[PDB]
Amino acid sequence: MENDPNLFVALYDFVASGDNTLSITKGEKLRVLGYNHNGEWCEAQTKNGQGWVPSQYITPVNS
């Protein structure tokens, strides 16, 4: 189905190393709001809050 272009899903769990990072569970949906300058880090919003997550751990839902 057609999703927001900024809806992503987690490929792996990721546990925040504190500091404005966001912990995520494999399969969770997360809406990306922003990138750092090379897009390896994403400012994301999930059902638990907002914070930074690594691109290598997530993927956009759309194809």
XYZ file of N, CA and C in Angstrom:
189
model
N 0.845 -1.222 0.000
C 0.000 0.000 0.000
C 0.874 1.264 0.000
N 0.292 2.436 -0.189
C 1.068 3.671 -0.327
C 1.384 4.300 1.040
N 2.645 4.362 1.477
C 2.944 4.943 2.765
C 3.623 6.291 2.590
N 3.664 7.092 3.647
C 4.521 8.268 3.676
C 5.960 7.954 3.214
N 6.545 8.779 2.336
C 7.918 8.534 1.917
C 8.931 8.557 3.081
N 8.571 9.092 4.248
C 9.507 9.133 5.381
C 9.176 8.087 6.468
N 8.337 7.104 6.140
C 8.089 5.951 7.024
C 9.146 4.880 6.749
N 9.777 4.409 7.821
C 10.871 3.471 7.768
C 10.487 2.318 8.698
N 11.204 1.217 8.559
C 11.102 0.086 9.479
C 12.488 -0.317 9.971
N 12.579 -0.738 11.231
C 13.848 -1.179 11.813
C 14.191 -2.583 11.331
N 15.427 -2.723 10.866
C 15.992 -3.989 10.410
C 16.601 -4.787 11.577
N 17.009 -4.083 12.624
C 17.603 -4.697 13.811
C 17.199 -3.902 15.014
N 17.302 -4.528 16.182
C 17.169 -3.766 17.421
C 18.336 -2.765 17.479
N 18.142 -1.657 18.166
C 19.197 -0.683 18.402
C 18.885 -0.129 19.774
N 19.859 -0.226 20.680
C 19.755 0.307 22.032
C 20.542 1.616 22.138
N 19.834 2.725 22.347
C 20.437 4.043 22.519
C 21.627 3.993 23.463
N 22.731 4.610 23.054
C 23.788 4.970 23.989
C 23.424 6.350 24.534
N 22.476 6.374 25.466
C 21.904 7.623 25.958
C 22.041 8.745 24.946
N 21.945 9.983 25.422
C 22.331 11.140 24.623
C 21.459 11.435 23.402
N 20.145 11.498 23.587
C 19.297 11.983 22.505
C 19.251 11.000 21.337
N 19.735 9.789 21.578
C 19.548 8.671 20.653
C 18.268 7.934 21.018
N 17.708 7.215 20.053
C 16.440 6.505 20.235
C 16.617 4.980 20.118
N 16.140 4.230 21.111
C 16.173 2.775 21.073
C 15.037 2.253 20.189
N 15.328 1.220 19.397
C 14.347 0.666 18.442
C 14.358 -0.857 18.419
N 13.221 -1.441 18.062
C 13.082 -2.873 17.996
C 12.917 -3.253 16.524
N 13.513 -4.371 16.137
C 13.435 -4.908 14.797
C 11.969 -5.044 14.386
N 11.624 -4.500 13.217
C 10.249 -4.409 12.734
C 9.407 -3.196 13.091
N 9.904 -2.326 13.977
C 9.152 -1.184 14.439
C 9.107 -0.186 13.293
N 7.977 0.501 13.209
C 7.833 1.638 12.310
C 8.350 2.902 12.954
N 9.034 3.703 12.143
C 9.628 4.948 12.615
C 9.623 6.010 11.521
N 9.112 7.191 11.852
C 8.996 8.275 10.883
C 10.197 9.212 10.959
N 10.965 9.269 9.875
C 12.183 10.052 9.847
C 11.858 11.531 9.602
N 12.425 12.403 10.431
C 12.133 13.829 10.319
C 13.314 14.577 9.714
N 14.494 13.994 9.888
C 15.718 14.685 9.513
C 16.885 13.737 9.380
N 17.920 14.219 8.705
C 19.197 13.543 8.525
C 20.293 14.463 9.079
N 21.374 13.890 9.599
C 22.665 14.587 9.588
C 23.165 14.786 8.170
N 24.323 15.417 8.036
C 24.663 15.894 6.711
C 24.913 14.790 5.664
N 25.340 13.593 6.065
C 25.535 12.474 5.095
C 24.503 11.366 5.162
N 23.464 11.643 5.959
C 22.282 10.788 6.100
C 22.504 9.421 6.700
N 23.658 9.251 7.342
C 23.918 8.011 8.101
C 23.233 8.019 9.465
N 22.876 9.213 9.945
C 22.121 9.314 11.185
C 20.775 10.017 10.904
N 19.684 9.493 11.453
C 18.320 10.004 11.229
C 17.672 10.456 12.547
N 17.098 11.655 12.537
C 16.257 12.129 13.638
C 14.909 11.464 13.392
N 14.510 10.545 14.270
C 13.293 9.772 14.014
C 12.298 9.878 15.169
N 11.030 9.622 14.847
C 9.947 9.603 15.822
C 9.272 8.230 15.747
N 9.065 7.607 16.906
C 8.431 6.283 17.029
C 7.366 6.346 18.122
N 6.790 5.198 18.483
C 5.776 5.165 19.554
C 6.335 5.436 20.958
N 7.657 5.525 21.095
C 8.302 5.866 22.361
C 8.976 7.228 22.488
N 9.168 7.961 21.397
C 9.754 9.293 21.511
C 10.423 9.733 20.227
N 11.322 10.729 20.302
C 12.117 11.197 19.179
C 13.582 11.075 19.546
N 14.408 10.878 18.531
C 15.829 10.809 18.757
C 16.602 10.273 17.582
N 17.930 10.226 17.720
C 18.773 9.846 16.570
C 18.834 8.320 16.465
N 18.759 7.805 15.229
C 18.987 6.399 14.922
C 19.872 6.257 13.673
N 20.652 5.165 13.557
C 21.541 5.001 12.398
C 20.803 4.458 11.171
N 20.950 5.133 10.039
C 20.500 4.565 8.773
C 20.801 3.094 8.467
N 21.979 2.607 8.838
C 22.306 1.222 8.537
C 21.396 0.230 9.254
N 20.640 0.677 10.261
C 19.726 -0.200 10.993
C 18.260 -0.125 10.536
N 17.923 0.717 9.562
C 16.518 0.934 9.204
C 16.396 0.991 7.678
N 15.168 0.945 7.153
C 15.047 1.049 5.710
C 13.698 1.684 5.400
N 13.592 2.481 4.327
C 12.254 3.090 4.031
C 11.263 1.969 3.677
N 9.984 2.182 3.958
C 9.005 1.104 3.781
C 8.653 1.034 2.303
N 8.608 2.192 1.642
C 8.142 2.254 0.256
C 9.041 1.579 -0.763
N 8.408 0.861 -1.697
C 9.055 0.398 -2.922
C 8.066 0.301 -4.099
